[PDB]
Write a protein that binds this ligand. Structure first.
Ligand SMILES: CC(=O)N[C@@H]1[C@@H](O)[C@H](O[C@@H]2O[C@H](CO)[C@H](O)[C@H](O[C@]3(C(=O)O)C[C@H](O)[C@@H](NC(C)=O)[C@H]([C@H](O)[C@H](O)CO)O3)[C@H]2O)[C@@H](CO)O[C@H]1O
Ligand SMILES: CC(=O)N[C@@H]1[C@@H](O)[C@H](O[C@@H]2O[C@H](CO)[C@H](O)[C@H](O[C@]3(C(=O)O)C[C@H](O)[C@@H](NC(C)=O)[C@H]([C@H](O)[C@H](O)CO)O3)[C@H]2O)[C@@H](CO)O[C@H]1O
Ligand SMILES: CC(=O)N[C@@H]1[C@@H](O)[C@H](O[C@@H]2O[C@H](CO)[C@H](O)[C@H](O[C@]3(C(=O)O)C[C@H](O)[C@@H](NC(C)=O)[C@H]([C@H](O)[C@H](O)CO)O3)[C@H]2O)[C@@H](CO)O[C@H]1O
Ligand SMILES: *[C@@H]1O[C@H](CO)[C@@H](O[C@@H]2O[C@H](CO)[C@@H](O)[C@H](O)[C@H]2NC(C)=O)[C@H](O)[C@H]1NC(C)=O
Ligand SMILES: *[C@@H]1O[C@H](CO)[C@@H](O[C@@H]2O[C@H](CO)[C@@H](O)[C@H](O)[C@H]2NC(C)=O)[C@H](O)[C@H]1NC(C)=O
Ligand SMILES: *[C@@H]1O[C@H](CO)[C@@H](O[C@@H]2O[C@H](CO)[C@@H](O)[C@H](O)[C@H]2NC(C)=O)[C@H](O)[C@H]1NC(C)=O
Ligand SMILES: *[C@@H]1O[C@H](CO)[C@@H](O)[C@H](O)[C@H]1NC(C)=O
Ligand SMILES: *[C@@H]1O[C@H](CO)[C@@H](O)[C@H](O)[C@H]1NC(C)=O
Ligand SMILES: *[C@@H]1O[C@H](CO)[C@@H](O)[C@H](O)[C@H]1NC(C)=O
Ligand SMILES: *[C@@H]1O[C@H](CO)[C@@H](O)[C@H](O)[C@H]1NC(C)=O
Ligand SMILES: *[C@@H]1O[C@H](CO)[C@@H](O)[C@H](O)[C@H]1NC(C)=O
Ligand SMILES: *[C@@H]1O[C@H](CO)[C@@H](O)[C@H](O)[C@H]1NC(C)=O
Ligand SMILES: *[C@@H]1O[C@H](CO)[C@@H](O)[C@H](O)[C@H]1NC(C)=O
Ligand SMILES: *[C@@H]1O[C@H](CO)[C@@H](O)[C@H](O)[C@H]1NC(C)=O
Ligand SMILES: *[C@@H]1O[C@H](CO)[C@@H](O)[C@H](O)[C@H]1NC(C)=O
Lengths: 170, 316, 316, 170, 316, 170
């Protein structure tokens, strides 16, 4: 991926995370839990479904017959038709192959992006309270009960509340 | 002491292709090329005419198998393999152009030409055209000389299209089994048939001789046609070997025409048709038949092109 | 105590479409589909011939309304609805192919065939072709028998194209109101006209009869043509019903041909034309006319496709 | 956006910024001011105009008439022409729709990128003098008169000059 | 005290185009439009027939220069400029359709029609068709009247295609130098030739007259054709001016046909051909010839389109 | 580039780096050396060659002749053919131009990405031992012999080993 998170500095995904696309597995004095980030998850889903709508939006054009499956048309004009149709088939086969490859690349990078967006947000919440691991993990110096970790998930975590103690715990 | 971030994953991922890779596994994908056919003509909500044994062109001239189709009306027109444009062996000049016209006509409405004859017989028939006894094309009249070997009076007949849309006009040239048999019907000497519309000129000289037996008969009839515009007049100058139009046809509106060998079905609706059935799909592309008509996904050579609907899968 | 970073925004953003969204607001956008037509043929700097009442094919044979167009020269050729290829009712075999040729000819230059006649009348005329009195096609000659009902001597006339490019050759078959009137002009018995170029063979038998009245007249003339290559010879074997070419035409170079009903204008320049005017645009696409010719944006079904020229708009 | 800045951790744009695309609104003892970053602004503009040139670069091909609006061509050959033209119309309508969507996505992400580029540059100037807010703001521990803030905008700000004092002000 | 990160660079970068820029320098690039032609027909591993002086259509009728090609067999068929379909001056009706058929036939296999004649001469010849002395088309027979000026008996000859695939049938109409010379060969009065297959009807009346000298001769022969389906019968009703088919042709399978003026070469292999040679390339596109046939890169107007295979180059 | 590294906060490339695409030039008490990062280099190369394979994957369709270079076909049908062929030529010329431009943009950004990925990885290894320069350089407070710098390149560098000393050296 372009943003270096998925299949990147995050070594692998979680099969236990069935609740969303992106989430947190915490660890503390009270033990391990897990959850899902709705906001991030929904932003990928809504973008992805936006692509789908776009490619299912096909009010098509009418085409009629110009040849005859029961009573072959005159041969000259038959070969011109077949040449044209085969040329159009080639264009569309190319177009479809390119569209999906082009789209699939973006999808993969787009999901990679959203993970990185969530990551950096969190980093931005814990100003000098936590430090970076590198596996996709924030080691917290001050302690955090299940109330703390839920405060981070809710965007309510206050860095100034636990500042001095974590700072010194360095 | 810590809070890790991660993403979901699955034991069973779906492989897809990108700009950079082939077979990269993602969480979930969905197909974009349609392969599913309904093996029926899905005709729900459409005025449909299944021609069966009637040939589309036979609706204009009217051999017995087209008696019930002489003034039909349709949004959808279905041609069958078994369909036949003729009873007495014959062929249409420009057959396929006239088909394309009739396929999108919305059907036809006939109007009497008002031709009236004096000095010739007009009730000619044949065993090939059966209406409980020998007969002929319903919309046509087989013109002759009153008695065997008699002359044919040089004849000038005209029709003015007085209506607002153009009239499809059709006449037939006869080709008898012998040079002797053309003389019997219409007298000896070489006969001439010609046609003159304000935007059309052509001429027709008969060509007797021995063809092979079709429907038991070895003669042939050439059918011909032109569209005659509003307030224009068509003139028929002739001396024999001529099959005369009795009614002129007019096109009703719009339709679509297809060729098939599957059943009709008013329970399903579709707008993309081929000979094997109906493509009901919202997918942008299809790999079923490149000659499908109506409103269809674009045909593509590829059997499948999977579109990622989820992030890359990274298990274990 | 602080320094914030940000980006610009606007009260009024322009909505656009992306791969992911419909109607995402951006700072600024610009159109990519051209809708603006100039309702005139923009002809600045081009040798232009507006045929008016002359029909393009009529420049080859020369009915009175084409007298001023017999040797024209052009980069741009404009055909009008009112244009007419004939004075004496007639039709061109392969009309449209010959038009396509003349449209990109760069115009024409005529050269005397040098045909010379002995035993027949060559000054035939008609009231349909008015040059202050009855007349005929300027580039042609109506060939006859010296006196009424007289025979026609079987005739062999030839032209060798001695020039470096191929010669457009045109001859006309006459179709008289009666079988009686073909005999008057050219004597009785069935006449034959044939044509033989080193890469061409075809034959023409006349077809008298009663057509409807056009320009007051009920006869017709069939015009025909072939391109005769350098150092090749065309031979005309005939016995009547033949309208003779006097001059052969040669193509000058290159041009473009269009059909229109709007005025010419030497004040504006354009290279994309349609019947309603001129598309002057640098936009990659157009939604004005799918049959526009010249050098044009690609026609597209969409009325508008807006291209973002600024970042996403995030106000409030 | 792919880079998570515009409509991202920057909550919204500035309507007051009429001088460029990206800029600074400072705050200090001397009050609030605002400005524009030319370098970043120009790099987006030049890229965007690069796209435009690319799509206005159209020395086109000549096409002539193959049918007739006044004198309809023979019907068979007319229907082949119309089928071909309609097939080509479909290809181009698709091409144009895809081009603009594909291009528009990139534009939006490209502008998002440039904002992020400017952001990270600034962070890189203030090594331990300032810390991250998260709204798109750098809180400075040592004080900064209008002379200081202009030094940052000019790429002349020296971290070592105000190091020890800001460090301790933590 | 430090560890810097960086990337590679080069003194000589290759310029490329992007969505945003023209001529941005990158580390390395590779071409995507093929310009390299091999100036030979690369025929390794293919059954190849180089027609040389034989014209493709001449393989069906068999003038002397096609004597060695009457039953050929091929995957690849090469037509030469010098090739000629006729010895006695003539022309094929629908020449190009029949060529397209023969180009992909895989070659041909001939079978005796089994026509047998009584009352006419069938050994007609000419100095144009040289097999050490005057001769004629190998697969045909020139039908006559037994003695000079003698009548022609009205004749009915038929062939049933008893095989599983359709038979290519060909017959020729003769056009003599005079109206006098058509009477010599086949007696006076106007002769008729007609043809009747279960899906085909047409008629042919000869057209004598004076053509220009080709191969020294001023007469012409019109060749004609139809594909006759399995278990269908073709009937030839005639009274003169007819050149009779002796054998019927059958198509062997599949091939490809090209036109060229370069040498054959069994050392190189290719699947994309044009008249100047062979395009051997894995590149997606080509700028060599837009009429190249076989399996080829797509033709494009651009001479070169460079694809970056490395990062941006940032030296100094 | 989209990620702001190449032709970005890294002022220019290294012509001396002939061993890979991305690498390190260190400086210490023992002098300057240089090396290449294989992992990062290979990930760009493998992606790039993936594109190439994709565009050389062309099992093509057969087309036959529908006109005649020696014996010109009838003129009407000739002009329809030529119009069609020219229309197809236009589509492909567009397709090829767009493909390469579209692909070339991605390539450039993709290489920019990988550099950024390597950069951030390194930052993540040196948690408070080093600080950011801004030119694409990490200034190390604790000392590092050629053994140290090789440990970073091998992913074996231990931050906790040199923590306290570098921390205080601030
Ligand atoms: C099959 C066989 O045993 N012998 C054929 C024989 O078919 C054929 O004569 C024809 O016989 C058929 C029946 O099989 C018809 O009865 C034909 O008669 C009619 C017809 O039905 O078409 C009668 C009709 O009244 C005639 N009408 C007019 C207007 O003339 C037509 C018409 O003349 C012809 O169809 C035109 O050629 O014929 C009957 O001709 C003979 C003739 O070649 O050949 C045997 O070998
Ligand atoms: C309209 C009407 O009241 N009665 C028609 C009548 O038009 C028509 O005779 C024709 O009358 C027109 C005038 O309307 C012409 O005068 C025709 O004469 C000419 C002509 O001008 O074309 C004279 C000319 O010299 C003749 N030239 C030659 C070389 O023969 C031609 C020529 O013969 C014919 O055009 C070819 O058929 O005719 C005159 O024929 C009659 C005839 O059907 O019908 C009335 O009902
Ligand atoms: C060239 C010249 O000096 N004078 C021509 C002269 O060519 C031409 O007569 C023809 O002369 C050529 C030789 O140049 C042939 O010998 C023609 O004779 C044959 C032929 O070879 O084709 C003989 C053959 O047996 C005839 N076969 C049959 C079945 O009839 C054919 C055949 O009749 C004709 O080809 C069909 O028209 O002719 C010989 O005709 C004369 C005739 O116009 O003109 C001189 O000026
Ligand atoms: C044009 O292509 C069509 C197929 O798209 C050819 O028709 C098929 O021909 C094969 C073998 O000749 C048959 O098995 C099929 O029944 C045909 N299919 C259909 C749908 O018609 C056709 O022969 C080609 N036309 C010409 C003139 O070569
Ligand atoms: C091919 O399409 C053209 C339009 O692109 C058809 O021509 C139009 O026909 C409609 C109704 O029949 C008229 O209202 C217009 O005046 C026509 N427009 C033009 C530009 O010619 C044409 O009929 C179609 N051809 C065939 C053979 O069906
Ligand atoms: C269709 O285009 C072809 C070229 O693609 C034209 O043929 C060329 O004509 C030019 C000048 O007329 C000659 O110099 C070349 O020798 C021709 N090239 C080939 C490959 O044939 C052709 O004239 C066009 N057809 C029509 C009907 O205008
Ligand atoms: C799931 O895995 C099974 C392995 O047995 C395989 O057959 C199937 O195709 C897979 N399907 C999907 C959608 O991953
Ligand atoms: C995965 O995609 C399918 C279509 O292929 C879709 O119907 C479904 O919503 C998705 N399934 C899951 C389990 O996400
Ligand atoms: C046909 O003629 C009648 C007058 O009899 C008139 O009402 C109508 O407008 C004409 N139509 C056309 C198309 O000229
Ligand atoms: C600007 O806003 C007005 C609302 O009155 C709207 O009519 C107009 O279309 C808008 N135009 C643009 C370019 O945003
Ligand atoms: C916005 O785009 C238009 C074209 O739609 C362009 O002419 C103009 O430069 C732009 N206007 C502003 C105010 O940026
Ligand atoms: C035509 O013949 C003349 C000799 O009379 C010669 O100059 C010229 O090359 C010939 N042109 C062609 C195309 O054969
Ligand atoms: C390398 O530089 C030389 C300058 O002399 C130039 O001619 C050549 O085209 C360049 N080639 C490449 C691939 O950079
Ligand atoms: C650069 O690209 C060429 C093709 O243009 C390729 O053959 C080669 O591997 C590359 N050369 C170098 C020195 O990387
Ligand atoms: C042709 O007829 C024979 C019987 O003589 C039969 O074997 C074969 O099936 C028939 N073929 C066709 C195509 O009707």
């Amino acid at each position: 991926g372009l943003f270096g998170a998925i299949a990147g500095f995050i070594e692998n995904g979680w099969e236990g995370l069935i609740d969303g696309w992106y989430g947190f597995r915490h660890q503390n004095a009270q033990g391990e839990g897990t959850a899902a980030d709705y906001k991030s998850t929904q932003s990928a889903i809504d973008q992805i479904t936006g692509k789908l709508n776009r490619l299912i939006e096909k009010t098509n054009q009418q085409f009629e017959l110009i040849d005859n499956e029961f009573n072959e048309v005159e041969k000259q004009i038959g070969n011109v038709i077949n040449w044209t149709r085969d040329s159009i088939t080639e264009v569309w086969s190319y177009n479809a192959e390119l569209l999906v490859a082009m789209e699939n690349q973006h999808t993969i990078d787009l999901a990679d992006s959203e993970m990185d967006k969530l990551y950096e947000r969190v980093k931005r919440q814990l100003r000098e309270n936590a430090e970076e691991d590198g596996t996709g993990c924030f080691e917290i110096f001050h302690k955090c009960d299940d109330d703390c970790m839920a405060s981070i998930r809710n965007n309510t975590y206050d860095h100034s509340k636990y500042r001095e103690e974590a700072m010194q715990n360095r | 002491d810590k809070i890790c971030l991660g993403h979901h994953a699955v034991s069973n991922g779906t492989k897809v292709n990108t700009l950079t890779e082939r077979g990269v596994e993602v969480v979930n994908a969905t197909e974009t090329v349609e392969r599913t056919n309904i093996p029926r003509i899905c005709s729900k909500g459409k005025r449909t005419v299944d021609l069966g044994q009637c040939g589309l062109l036979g609706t204009i001239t009217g051999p017995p198998q087209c008696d019930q189709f002489l003034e039909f009306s349709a949004d959808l027109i279905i041609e069958r393999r078994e369909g036949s444009d003729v009873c007495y062996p014959g062929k249409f000049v420009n057959e396929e152009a006239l088909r394309q016209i009739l396929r999108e006509s919305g059907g036809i409405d006939k109007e009497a030409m008002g031709f009236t004859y004096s000095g010739i017989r007009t009730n000619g028939a044949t065993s090939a055209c059966r209406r409980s006894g020998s007969s002929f094309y319903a919309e046509m009249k087989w013109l002759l000389s009153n008695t065997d070997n008699a002359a044919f009076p040089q004849m000038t007949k005209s029709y003015k299209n007085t209506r607002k849309s153009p009239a499809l006009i059709v006449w037939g040239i006869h080709h008898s089994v012998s040079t002797a048999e053309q003389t019997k019907l219409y007298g000896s000497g070489n006969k001439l048939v010609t046609v003159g519309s304000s935007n059309y000129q052509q001429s027709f000289v008969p060509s007797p001789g021995a063809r092979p037996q079709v429907n038991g008969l070895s003669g042939r009839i050439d059918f011909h046609w032109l569209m005659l515009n509003p307030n224009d007049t068509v003139t028929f100058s002739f001396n024999g070997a001529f099959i005369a139009p009795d009614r002129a046809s007019f096109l009703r509106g719009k339709s679509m025409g297809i060729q098939s060998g599957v059943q009709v079905d008013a329970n399903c609706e579709g707008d993309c048709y081929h000979s094997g059935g109906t493509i009901i799909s919202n997918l942008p592309f299809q790999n079923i038949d490149s000659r499908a008509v109506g409103k269809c996904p674009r045909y593509v050579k590829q059997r499948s092109l999977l579109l990622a609907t989820g992030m890359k899968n990274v298990p274990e």
